[PDB]
Amino acid sequence: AKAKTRSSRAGLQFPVGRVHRLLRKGNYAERVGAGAPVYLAAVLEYLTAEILELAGNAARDNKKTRIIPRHLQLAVRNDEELNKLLGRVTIAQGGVLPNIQSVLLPK
Amino acid sequence: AKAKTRSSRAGLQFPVGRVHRLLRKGNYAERVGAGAPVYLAAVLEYLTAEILELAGNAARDNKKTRIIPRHLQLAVRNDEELNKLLGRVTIAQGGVLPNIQSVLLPK
Amino acid sequence: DGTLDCISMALTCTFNRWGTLLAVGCNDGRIVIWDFLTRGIAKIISAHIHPVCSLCWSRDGHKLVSASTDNIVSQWDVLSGDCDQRFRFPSPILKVQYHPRDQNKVLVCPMKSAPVMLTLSDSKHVVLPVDDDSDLNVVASFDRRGEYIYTGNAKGKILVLKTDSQDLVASFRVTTGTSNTTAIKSIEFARKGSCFLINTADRIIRVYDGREILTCGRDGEPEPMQKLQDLVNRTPWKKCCFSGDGEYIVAGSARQHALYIWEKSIGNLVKILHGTRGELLLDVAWHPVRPIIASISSGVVSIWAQNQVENWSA
Amino acid sequence: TRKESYAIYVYKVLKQVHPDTGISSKAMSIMNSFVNDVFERIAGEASRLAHYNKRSTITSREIQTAVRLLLPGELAKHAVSEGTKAVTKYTSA
Amino acid sequence: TRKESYAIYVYKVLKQVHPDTGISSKAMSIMNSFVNDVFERIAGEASRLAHYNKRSTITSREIQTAVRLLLPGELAKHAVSEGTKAVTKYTSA
Amino acid sequence: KVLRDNIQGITKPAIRRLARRGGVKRISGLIYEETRGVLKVFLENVIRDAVTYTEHAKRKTVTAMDVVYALKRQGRTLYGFG
Amino acid sequence: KVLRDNIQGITKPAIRRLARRGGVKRISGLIYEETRGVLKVFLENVIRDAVTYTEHAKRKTVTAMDVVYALKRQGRTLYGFG
Amino acid sequence: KPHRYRPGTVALREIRRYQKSTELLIRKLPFQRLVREIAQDFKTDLRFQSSAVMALQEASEAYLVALFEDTNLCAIHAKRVTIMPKDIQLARRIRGER
Amino acid sequence: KPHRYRPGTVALREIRRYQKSTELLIRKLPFQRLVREIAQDFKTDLRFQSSAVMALQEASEAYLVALFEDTNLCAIHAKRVTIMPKDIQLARRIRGER
DNA sequence: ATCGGATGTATATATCTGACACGTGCCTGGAGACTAGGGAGTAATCCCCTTGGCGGTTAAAACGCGGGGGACAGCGCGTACGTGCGTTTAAGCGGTGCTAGAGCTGTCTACGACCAATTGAGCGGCCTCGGCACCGGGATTCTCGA
DNA sequence: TCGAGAATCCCGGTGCCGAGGCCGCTCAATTGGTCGTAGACAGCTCTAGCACCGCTTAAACGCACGTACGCGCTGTCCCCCGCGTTTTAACCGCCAAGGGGATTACTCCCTAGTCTCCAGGCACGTGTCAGATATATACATCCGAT
């Protein structure tokens, strides 16, 4: 009767028990494997780390401590693979990255 | 006690029991309602009737009996609602409805 | 960058050991041995009346071999100008080649027959074998070391045999990208080491190294040291060969009357000497010890001087 | 291996709407896959909607709403009409 | 009513990535919605794959295939490496 | 308490600022009301689906989740609200 | 039995007939090989996903269902094969 | 001597400013009344959560930004710098909105 | 006196013919070898069902037809009748393929 | 190309907050422990479909060959649109006020789940014939120099 | 601008294999019950949405006006269409080996399901400081006189 959360067993910061319960009661399959929630929480944690890295980078670049939606937009737009992941997704208070076309410049 | 299929009781041609089995094995809910497969068979029959009527009209217009994929594609493209339903769909051997732009015509 | 108007009716061009004499088998069946230094005639030997399809210089630059369209293979000398040998055999010849290390064996490639190595001393000759048994258009060439013969069939199959025993020391059917087969146009060599090249009919010159070829032996999968072609025009080359130093390789685009020189190691295109658009290029060769390129277009000889930076700035 | 399909039902519906009209096996397979795709889309939308309402039983109302969502306009109108009529016919017995 | 979310976990991974920085409530809601969306994408792909293989047990291999399908290139590579490491650490308990 | 004819709630300078955000330099007048139609058209899709969800929910108002799902089923999913 | 460099399997007259089907009247040469790239690019998506499905199937060949699912997950579903 | 910038310069400056900024470029209450008036087409006395209404408005605003983006693209492709209704119709046609 | 049609007329006739026709406008074996060569990027000795290969080829062919369609649309919008690589790039950009 | 000037924009400082970090008590969902069953893994076999190759045909790709026509660049223009200045309008805040409907809880019932017993609808497999693919030819119809 | 000439429409005839009707032979659909529970309904709550007031003011409407960019026309000129020849390799038909695809039969290790327990997560306060707003300043930038 030694208590220990499954997230610690995987050494992650996402709730493996919660995602396992959700995959169970979410009607995706008759049965759910044991390591599948661990793997899914792992990939979710990796994706969150990847996006939050660029988010905090842009926030520090703008001298802002708390990350704002604009920083999320800049992060997901500057990255190539991340933008390809969210190619048809919009963000609240996201706006558009600064982008001026070539000919539009004065001459 | 004799047995009659539900489609006969519903006055339908599509297999109601087969749709019920598909819904059960499809992991769409913990338990499918009684009238849900009947309703689904009904709407599927209506859609098939519409598309096949248009296809047969096109085939009779082409002086042929055997409905070929070309007739199906032409019938699909010759209806606004059906096109919007299948705009993201590619039909085999379909080609494109005969269409030429304006300026491409000589003078 | 030059021409030779005194030479007319040209069909072939070959270089001697020092490359100072160009043998021109003329349309009227004569051989003009033209000297490079004096830019004039070194010898003229009226061999026959049939156009010479191919010539080949001796290792010591003394003997020469003519192959007229009369199905006649003959051997002559540069100085005497007398017919040392003359023989007739059917299936007119496309390529004759002296043994690079021997002055008796000469390779001769007939149309409807397998290549035959004939002895200059006596009446002995060895018929080279055939893999696919239905070539009917086959090329062959002696190796640079005078120890092997590469034979290319009409279906990409290449047999490397020993120049003496003609035993199977290597064999490989080369791909064509599309994994099909292709009739071998030419198999030529360089003067240095063993790096050689194969010009095919699917417009891909393959720069191979004969060491790995001999190493693979049976059912080998050899890949060329370099791939050469014209990506923008897709020109089947009538003849391809190394430069004088061998580090560069020249190919003769006959359809558009030009010469294309690439490298060997990296194989990048050195440059393109595009001749006059009018004529039809037939033959091409490079001076073995000089940066000179002797081409032959529509029957007349043209010269290309890759002059270095001097002669105008010193 | 018994491979379940809808060919016979498409044939019946065709004979109903078009008595003396033929159909190719290729076009029959296209129609079968089209039925399968429409059924998949409708079932997925209905399941998502039912889950959004924290329900667990896909019923006639769910399918009607999913049809109103997926088909545009008069197609959806005639579809809901036919579905209601079939539901009435089945429930009457 | 305890309407759950992923807020605390996003906060934790943020602190472990950048301790000095913080995050607003709206940005946290965006992160929660994005997590839910990508997780539902992966779940749907896994369910579709399981149905395609007629298997009723979603396991780690299904998630591997789903993430290799969804995430592009190097994202997928790093994600599958992290997932394999995590599942190996967990199974070695 | 009935609303009508408020399509002009979107104004010419508002559309112009929106186009400026879109990087547009010069705009013709015939665009503005034209754009309005487009905008309205757009709503007639999502708005419809929105109420449809509420129609199934047997409720009488619209939640954020409703419009999020409506945009999702239209391939225009939106984050920040669930 | 190894294949390579067969991108020219698509030919200029083939692309031209395809464009004619697309109703194109006049075409520049710089299109042709350009188009090739596009085509190749397209495959690098679906083809990839294709083998991925087989990768999960622990098989060694590709079935029609595989490429159908690959096109489906890319919003380009295809009928006629399941 | 009053000073006036050349045309487009003020437009470019406003473009930079708005690309940098993030707030909504549409007045709240007019858009809300418009949403109510349009929803009248489906059922009366339909209420709305304020947050839901601004979410809808901002999603549609971002869709409008995107649409203006491709219209600008087709315009600069047409060797022009002024968008025209034909360009918007072309963009919506390519996107598959008709 | 040899006869020659004006340019485009034969092109328009072929357009009508191919719009009427339905067979594949790409040779089978070259496309199949291309698919094998491209799949070599993921695993060797990968076999393919013939029907699967023609299904892939025809789906990609229809995608190419669609792409040429919008390129034609942007071209006729640009007051031109000759498609250009910039037009294809614009079409793929609007479709969201880059 | 240059310099003075106006305008707009980035900055520092003040300072003022309200959203935000976190500390807490409590709940319930997640971890532990245990039991059943059976989907998945293994192996062995059968076989269909794949890959491979060869030979003859020609439809088709490649190449080239004139030549006319759309792409494009320049030029002119005038109309429509940015821009700045006004005047005028509802937009935004917040403030209170009413309550209609979300939103929660508690039933109790009617409604599938599920299990078993039963069997004809449906499906692999088998003839079989005629609509249709192909074709030969002849009339028909679009186009291009007069 | 009317014939000449080339590509298409169509009519009739030939022959074939796919479409279709039919046949055993399952097994998945039907029917009858019993169980446990999903949610329909009733009822109570409160809060968030709805509506009006008023107040200030940023923002919208309209005008005047310069002006510059869409548009239209000329002229050139490349370049791609068009059509002939020449090449090839796609295709198709056939034959071959086997290799993984698919199936079936065992077998069990894994997971659903159940009960117990407690502990991390979550609603809810609580200071508190990161950033939002104003102001004055200092600099970067466009633009006209030169």
Author numbering:
A (entry chain I), B (entry chain M): 12 to 118
C (entry chain A): 18 to 331
D (entry chain N), E (entry chain J): 29 to 121
F (entry chain L), G (entry chain H): 20 to 101
H (entry chain K), I (entry chain G): 37 to 134
What is the paper's account of this structure, in its own sentences?
Mixed lineage leukemia (MLL) family enzymes, including MLL1-4/KMT2A-2D, SET1A/KMT2F, and SET1B/KMT2G, are the major histone lysine 4 (K4) methyltransferases in mammals. The MLL family enzymes share an evolutionarily conserved catalytic Su(Var), Enhancer of Zeste, Trithorax (SET) domain14 as well as four highly conserved SET-interacting proteins, i.e., RbBP5 (retinoblastoma-binding protein 5), ASH2L (Absent, small, homeotic disks-2-like), WDR5 (WD40 repeat-containing protein 5), and DPY30 (DumPY protein 30). Here we report the single-particle cryo-EM structure of the human MLL1 core complex bound to the NCP. Importantly, we show that the MLL1 core complex docks on the NCP through concurrent interactions of ASH2L/RbBP5 with nucleosomal DNA and histone H4.
The sub-population particles of RbBP5-NCP from the MLL1RWSAD-NCP dataset were resolved at a resolution of 4.2 Å. Within the MLL1RWSAD-NCP complex, the RbBP5-NCP interfaces were found to be less dynamic. The structure showed that RbBP5 bound to the NCP by simultaneously engaging DNA (SHL1.5) and histone H4 N-terminal tail. The interactions involved six consecutive loops emanating from the WD40 repeats of RbBP5. Notably, RbBP5 interacted with DNA SHL1.5 through four positively charged arginine residues (Quad-R) located in the β18–β19 (R220), β20–β21 (R251), β22–β23 (R272), and β24–β25 (R294) loops, respectively, which made electrostatic interactions with the DNA phosphate backbone. The second RbBP5-NCP interface includes two loops, an insertion loop (β16–β17 loop, referred to herein as I-loop) and an anchoring loop (β19–β20 loop, referred to herein as A-loop), of RbBP5. The I-loop was positioned between the N-terminal tail of histone H4 and nucleosomal DNA. The A-loop run parallel to the H4 tail, which was positioned between the I-/A-loops of RbBP5 and the helix α1 (Leu65–Asp77) of histone H3. Among the RbBP5-NCP interactions, Quad-R was observed to be the main contributor to NCP binding. The mutation of Quad-R significantly reduced RbBP5 binding to the NCP, whereas deletion of the I- and A-loops had only a modest effect on NCP binding.
